[PDB]
Amino acid sequence: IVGGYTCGANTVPYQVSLNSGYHFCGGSLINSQWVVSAAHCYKSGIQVRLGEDNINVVEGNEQFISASKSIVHPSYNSNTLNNDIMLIKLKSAASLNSRVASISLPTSCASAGTQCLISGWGNTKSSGTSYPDVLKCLKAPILSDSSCKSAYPGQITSNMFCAGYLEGGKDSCQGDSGGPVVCSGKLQGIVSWGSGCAQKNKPGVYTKVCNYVSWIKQTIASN
Numbered sequence: 001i002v003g004g005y006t007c008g009a010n011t012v013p014y015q016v017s018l019n020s021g022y023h024f025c026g027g028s029l030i031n032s033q034w035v036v037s038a039a040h041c042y043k044s045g046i047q048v049r050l051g052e053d054n055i056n057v058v059e060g061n062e063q064f065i066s067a068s069k070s071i072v073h074p075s076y077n078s079n080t081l082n083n084d085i086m087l088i089k090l091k092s093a094a095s096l097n098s099r100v101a102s103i104s105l106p107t108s109c110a111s112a113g114t115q116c117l118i119s120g121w122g123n124t125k126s127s128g129t130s131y132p133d134v135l136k137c138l139k140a141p142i143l144s145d146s147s148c149k150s151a152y153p154g155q156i157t158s159n160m161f162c163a164g165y166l167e168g169g170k171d172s173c174q175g176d177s178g179g180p181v182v183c184s185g186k187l188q189g190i191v192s193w194g195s196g197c198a199q200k201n202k203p204g205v206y207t208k209v210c211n212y213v214s215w216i217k218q219t220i221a222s223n
């Protein structure tokens, strides 16, 4: 997260870190057994880390639980990033309390202009590289479809929305991928792609979770 703020420990209790020997992506806990992340975060051997603030220090509220299975969206296209969503099942249920909690799926799609909360352990620099230890947060509005399309001509599908700041300075970045965009208390987006971080006229692009609720519910009912 570039241009954001320190969230505060366990103030984003649905935020997970995906670890394969190192942090590589975020995710969102949607019930005691399931995480939603980006399909471009897929890999084998995932350990889900819940209850994290500093990802480099064991502070006392963590739960580390291995994934038993991952399910990439059946129509994910890694070229276009259309349908950039994945479900990850935990080998054992998480214990839910104030420091670890699920986030609700949306009922309706979020509105242009709505401020949302984006979070992650990704790079904090637009130019160059610096990774934080503690979870970072960013308040960012959803942009109009027309401004999103103008920023990325020919690339925005109905399964994507833009959020952030056309002037630059404030955005998600590498290592935030797969993490949450929460608007009005519901999971509306997944950190998906863009062109760099915090560059002018290149806002972040987010998977539009409201399009996927049916697939999520059906999948978790059978796996």
Ligand SMILES: NCc1ccccc1
Residues within 6 Å of the ligand: 153, 154, 155
């Ligand atoms: N083919 C998409 C596109 C449209 C206008 C400008 C650039 C790219």
Ligand SMILES: NCc1ccccc1
Residues within 6 Å of the ligand: 171, 172, 173, 174, 175, 176, 177, 191, 192, 193, 194, 195, 196, 197, 198, 203, 204, 205
């Ligand atoms: N600046 C949007 C973005 C997020 C994740 C990875 C690449 C780019």
Ligand SMILES: [Ca+2]
Residues within 6 Å of the ligand: 052, 053, 054, 055, 056, 057, 058, 059, 060, 062
């Ligand atoms: Ca920790």
